[PDB]
C-alpha cells in the first residue's frame, strides 16, 4: 500500500498543476497563433 | 429585349470563345510576371 499511496499523492500533487498547465496551454495557443500571424520562421527544432 | 444573338452567331461560339480565350492570355502572363517578382518577399521570411 506504500506504493499505492505514493502514486496517489503524486497524482494529487499533479492535480493542482493541472490547471496551471491548462492555462499555459491556452496562453501558448494564443502566443503560437499570434506568432503565426506575426509570420515568424519557426525553427526546424520547433515542436508543434 | 433580345437575348439570343449568341445562338444567332454566324460563326458559332468560336468568335465568343476566342474572346474569352484572350482572357487567360493576359491574366496568365500577368500572374506569371507577378509570381517570380512576388518571390522576393521570401527574403523577409528568412531572418538574419
Amino acid at each position: 500500500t506504500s506504493d499505492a499511496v505514493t502514486f496517489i499523492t503524486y497524482v494529487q500533487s499533479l492535480k493542482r498543476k493541472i490547471k496551471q498547465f491548462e492555462k499555459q496551454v491556452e496562453l501558448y495557443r494564443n502566443g503560437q497563433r499570434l506568432l503565426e500571424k506575426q509570420r515568424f520562421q519557426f525553427p526546424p527544432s520547433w515542436l508543434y | 429585349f433580345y437575348r439570343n444573338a449568341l445562338t444567332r452567331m454566324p460563326d458559332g461560339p468560336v468568335a465568343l470563345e476566342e474572346s474569352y480565350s484572350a482572357v487567360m492570355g493576359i491574366v496568365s502572363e500577368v500572374e506569371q510576371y507577378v509570381k517570380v517578382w512576388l518571390q522576393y518577399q521570401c527574403l523577409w521570411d528568412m531572418q538574419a
Partner: protein, 49 residues
Amino acid sequence: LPSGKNILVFGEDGSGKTTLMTKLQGAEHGKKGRGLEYLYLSVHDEDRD
C-alpha cells in the same frame, strides 16, 4: 496557405443562381448576362488571420 480553389455550377436560365452566388459574398445582385460569368468568394479565417 490554401489558394486556387474553384467552383462551377449549372442553373437553368433565370433560376436565381446569380442571386445565390452574389448573396454568398454579400452583394445584393451581380449582372445577369449570357455565357460563362465570373465572381468571388472572399473567405476569411481568423485562426490564420
